[PDB]
Amino acid sequence: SMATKIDKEACRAAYNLVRDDGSAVIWVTFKYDGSTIVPGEQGAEYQHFIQQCTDDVRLFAFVRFTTGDAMSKRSKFALITWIGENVSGLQRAKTGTDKTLVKEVVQNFAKEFVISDRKELEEDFIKSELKK
């Protein structure tokens, strides 16, 4: 059984991309390429991110959400571990615990989520949770 590996250089670059004020990329994913975690799709629109979250896949994501009650909006970042509902038992556990490895790269975020219900990826839901 192969232990998980991570391409830290490639992953750190994707993470930095979301953090950069010079970037129009608000979401990036990290997926398994064999047993190595590498960057997956990336985008400017959150809805396109939800489309990546199929019940058959497991991925991690780093997202920049725009929040704010007053006139002065504030960016909030989230780490999301998405584990599709059809993911095998052994791999679901491996994924759940691989997030500490991913957090060695994704070091800063307002809140982290572990989600298996597609309804919780809705921006309204995520943002209401970010306010707690």
From Swiss-Prot:
Enumerate the residue ranges of region (Flexible and important for F-actin binding).
67-76
> Which PROSITE patterns does the record cross-reference, listed alphabetically?
ADF_H
Single annotated GO MF = actin binding
Under SMART domains, the record lists: ADF (SM00102)
Compartment list: Cytoplasm; Cytoplasm, Cytoskeleton; Nucleus
Every ADF-H domain range: 3-131
Expressed in which tissues: Widely expressed with highest levels in placenta, lung, kidney and peripheral blood leukocytes and lower levels in brain, liver and pancreas.
Q: Name one GO cellular component term.
A: cytosol
Question: Where N-acetylalanine occurs along the chain?
Answer: 3
Effect of altering residue 132 to A? Abolishes 5LO-binding activity
User: Where does the UniProt entry say this protein principally localizes?
Assistant: cytoplasm
The family database entries (SUPFAM superfamilies) matched by this protein are listed as:
Actin depolymerizing proteins
Give the record's family classification: Belongs to the actin-binding proteins ADF family. Coactosin subfamily.
Its quaternary organisation is: Interacts with 5-lipoxygenase (ALOX5/5LO) in a calcium-independent manner. Binds to F-actin with a stoichiometry of 1:2.
Q: What is this protein called?
A: Coactosin-like protein
Organism of origin is: Homo sapiens (Human)
* Taxonomic placement: Eukaryota, Metazoa, Chordata, Craniata, Vertebrata
Question: Gene symbol?
Answer: COTL1
